[PDB]
Amino acid sequence: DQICIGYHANNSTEQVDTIMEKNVTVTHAQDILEKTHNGKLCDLNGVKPLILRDCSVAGWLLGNPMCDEFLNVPEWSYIVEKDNPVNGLCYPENFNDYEELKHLLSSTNHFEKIRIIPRSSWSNHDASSGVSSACPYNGRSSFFRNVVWLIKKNNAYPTIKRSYNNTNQEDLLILWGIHHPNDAAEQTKLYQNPTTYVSVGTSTLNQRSVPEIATRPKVNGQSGRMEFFWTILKPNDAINFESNGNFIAPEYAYKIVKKGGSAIMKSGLEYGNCNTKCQTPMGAINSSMPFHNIHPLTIGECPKYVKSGRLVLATGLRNVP
Amino acid sequence: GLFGAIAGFIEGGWQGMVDGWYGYHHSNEQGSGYAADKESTQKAIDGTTNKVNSIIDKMNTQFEAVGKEFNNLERRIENLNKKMEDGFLDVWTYNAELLVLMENERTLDFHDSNVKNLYDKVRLQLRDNAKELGNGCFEFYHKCDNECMESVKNGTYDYP
Numbered sequence: 108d109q110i111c112i113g114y115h116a117n118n119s120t121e122q123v124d125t126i127m128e129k130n131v132t133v134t135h136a137q138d139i140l141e142k143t144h145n146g147k148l149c150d151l152n153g154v155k156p157l158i159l160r161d162c163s164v165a166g167w168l169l170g171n172p173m174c175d176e177f178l179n180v181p182e183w184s185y186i187v188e189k190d191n192p193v194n195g196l197c198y199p200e201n202f203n204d205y206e207e208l209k210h211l212l213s214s215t216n217h218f219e220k221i222r223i224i225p226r227s228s229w230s231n232h233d234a235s236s237g238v239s240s241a242c243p244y245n246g247r248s249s250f251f252r253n254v255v256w257l258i259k260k261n262n263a264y265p266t267i268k269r270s271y272n273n274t275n276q277e278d279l280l281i282l283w284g285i286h287h288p289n290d291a292a293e294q295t296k297l298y299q300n301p302t303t304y305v306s307v308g309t310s311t312l313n314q315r316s317v318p319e320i321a322t323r324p325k326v327n328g329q330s331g332r333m334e335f336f337w338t339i340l341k342p343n344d345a346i347n348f349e350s351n352g353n354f355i356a357p358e359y360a361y362k363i364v365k366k367g368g369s370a371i372m373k374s375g376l377e378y379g380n381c382n383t384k385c386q387t388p389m390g391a392i393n394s395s396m397p398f399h400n401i402h403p404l405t406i407g408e409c410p411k412y413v414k415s416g417r418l419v420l421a422t423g424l425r426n427v428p
Numbered sequence: 429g430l431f432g433a434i435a436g437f438i439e440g441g442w443q444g445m446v447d448g449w450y451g452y453h454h455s456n457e458q459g460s461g462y463a464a465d466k467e468s469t470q471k472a473i474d475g476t477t478n479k480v481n482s483i484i485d486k487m488n489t490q491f492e493a494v495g496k497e498f499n500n501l502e503r504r505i506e507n508l509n510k511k512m513e514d515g516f517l518d519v520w521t522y523n524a525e526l527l528v529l530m531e532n533e534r535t536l537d538f539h540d541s542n543v544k545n546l547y548d549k550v551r552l553q554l555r556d557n558a559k560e561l562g563n564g565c566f567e568f569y570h571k572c573d574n575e576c577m578e579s580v581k582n583g584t585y586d587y588p
C-alpha cells in the first residue's frame with residue numbers, strides 16, 4: 108500500500124525562457140504581448156480624426172484652392188498628414204516657424220475659422236487681381252483663400268493701417284505674409300511704390316518685414332516667393348498692420364479650442380470607418396495585453412510599447428512527460 | 429530544479445491529475461487514484477496571480493513617445509530627440525524582457541519548492557509508519573485504506 112506526492116502534467120506545448128535555459132515547456136503560460144492591429148485609422152472614442160489626405164497643414168490653414176475639403180473642419184481627435192502631401196504652398200515660398208505651429212496644433216482639438224477682415228473692406232486697394240497660375244482653381248488663376256494678395260489700385264498703393272481686436276474668449280491664430288518679387292519692374296507693376304514693408308505689432312509682437320526683390324528658379328512656374336507668418340492674439344489684445352506694399356493680408360483667422368490632447372500622426376492610410384480606444388499610424392489596437400509591439404507613436408489608452416517579438420510569462424510548472 | 433523535486437527525485441508529472449498542480453496518488457486494497465492538494469495548489473495560484481499583476485502594474489509608467497517635426501537646419505536637435513525616444517524604448521524593452529526572464533526562473537523554482545515542501549510535510553507525518561521509496565512515494569508497513577489515505581491528505585493523520 109502506497110501514497111505518493113506528485114505534480115501536474117498536460118499536453119501543453121507552450122514555452123517560456125529563463126536566464127539558464129530557453130524554451131522550457133510549461134503546463135500553463137500567459138502571453139502578455141499584443142502583436143496585432145486592424146490596419147485602419149479609426150475614430151478615437153467616437154471622435155473622428157482630421158485626415159488631411161493630399162493637403163499639408165499649411166495648405167489647409169492658408170487655404171490652398173486644392174484643399175477646399177478643409178475650409179471649415181469640425182472638432183477632431185487626432186490629425187493625420189502624409190509624409191509628403193502634394194498640396195501645400197501652391198505659390199512657392201516659406202512658412203516661418205512652421206514646425207512650432209504644427210506642434211501647437213498637436214495640443215488642440217479644434218480651430219474654428221472666423222472672418223476678421225472682410226475682403227470687401229479694401230476700398231483703396233485691388234482685392235481681386237491677386238491671383239496666380241501657381242494656385243489654379245476650376246481652370247483659372249486663384250490663390251490661398253484665407254489671405255488676400257493686395258494689388259495697387261488706380262496706379263497707387265496708399266499706406267495700409269489696420270487694426271483688429273480679439274473680442275473672443277479664445278486665443279486667435281492669425282496668418283499673413285509678404286511677397287518677394289523677382290525684380291524691381293515687378294515691384295512697380297504690382298505695388299507702385301518701390302520701397303515697402305509690412306509691420307506688425309501686438310502687446311508682445313514687434314515685427315517689420317521688407318521684400319527681398321530677387322530672381323530665383325521657377326517652382327510651380329513662379330520665380331517669386333511668398334513668406335508667411337503667424338502669431339497668437341490673446342483675448343482682448345489687438346494686432347496692428349501697416350504696409351505700403353507686398354502685404355498678403357489676413358481675411359480669416361482661427362479661434363483655438365484647447366480641449367487639448369491631440370497628435371499629428373504621419374500615415375498614408377485614409378479613414379477606416381471604425382472606432383477604437385487606441386490608435387497607431389499603422390492601425391488600431393483593441394486589447395487587454397499590457398504590452399504591444401505595433402508602433403511607438405500611439406494615441407489614446409494603450410498597452411506599453413516595447414520592441415519585443417515575444418513576451419510570455421510562465422504561470423504553471425515545467426511540463427514533464 | 430533548484431529544490432530537486434520536479435524533474436528530480438520525482439522524475440515525471442502526472443497527466444492523470446487534472447484537479448491541480450500538486451497532489452497525491454494512493455494505492456491500497458480498495459483501489460487507487462489521483463487527488464490534487466487544493467491547499468498548496470490554491471496557495472500557488474494566489475502567488476502567481478499577484479506576481480503577474482505586480483509585473484503589469486510596475487510597467488505602467490514606461491516612456492511614451494511624442495511626434496515632433498524638425499526642419500533641414502534642425503538636424504542636431506532632431507537626432508537628439510530621436511536618440512532620446514529610442515533610448516527610453518530600449519530601456520523599457522530591456523526592463524520588460526529581463527523582468528520576465530528573471531521571474532520565469534523564480535516561478536519554476538517556486539513550483540519546485542511547493543512540491544518539495546508538500547513531500548516533506550507528508551514525510552514528517554508518516555514518521556515511522558511508512559517506508560520512503562525515494563521516488564516521491566511512501567509504502568506503508570501495515571496496510572492502509574481509503575479512510576487511512578484520506579487521513580494523510582486530511583492533514584489530520586496522527587496516531588493520536
Ligand SMILES: *[C@@H]1O[C@H](CO)[C@@H](O[C@@H]2O[C@H](CO)[C@@H](O)[C@H](O)[C@H]2NC(C)=O)[C@H](O)[C@H]1NC(C)=O
Pocket residue numbers: 272273343344345
Ligand atoms: C480691445 O478692446 C477691448 C474692449 O473695448 C479693450 O478693453 C476694454 O478697454 C476699456 C477702455 O480702456 C476698459 O475700460 C475695459 O475694462 C476693457 N475691457 C476689457 C475686456 O478688459 C481693449 O483695451 C482692447 N485691446 C487693445 C490692446 O487695444
Ligand SMILES: *[C@@H]1O[C@H](CO)[C@@H](O[C@@H]2O[C@H](CO)[C@@H](O)[C@H](O)[C@H]2NC(C)=O)[C@H](O)[C@H]1NC(C)=O
Pocket residue numbers: 574575576578579582584
Ligand atoms: C478527515 O479527517 C477526519 C478527522 O477530523 C477523519 O476521521 C473520520 O472522519 C469521518 C468523517 O469524514 C468520520 O465519519 C469517521 O468516524 C472519522 N474516523 C473515525 C473512524 O473515527 C477522516 O478519516 C478524514 N478523511 C475522511 C473524510 O475520511
Ligand SMILES: *[C@@H]1O[C@H](CO)[C@@H](O)[C@H](O)[C@H]1NC(C)=O
Pocket residue numbers: 118119
Ligand atoms: C490535449 O492537447 C490538445 C492539443 O493542444 C488539446 O486540443 C486537447 O484539449 C488536450 N486534451 C485535453 C486536456 O482536453
Ligand SMILES: *[C@@H]1O[C@H](CO)[C@@H](O)[C@H](O)[C@H]1NC(C)=O
Pocket residue numbers: 129130
Ligand atoms: C526555441 O524554440 C523555437 C520553436 O519555435 C525555435 O524557433 C527557437 O530557435 C528555439 N530556440 C533555441 C534555444 O534553439
Ligand SMILES: *[C@@H]1O[C@H](CO)[C@@H](O)[C@H](O)[C@H]1NC(C)=O
Pocket residue numbers: 382383384393394
Ligand atoms: C474590443 O473587443 C471586445 C471583444 O469583442 C469588444 O467587446 C470591444 O467592443 C472591442 N473594442 C473596440 C473599441 O474595438
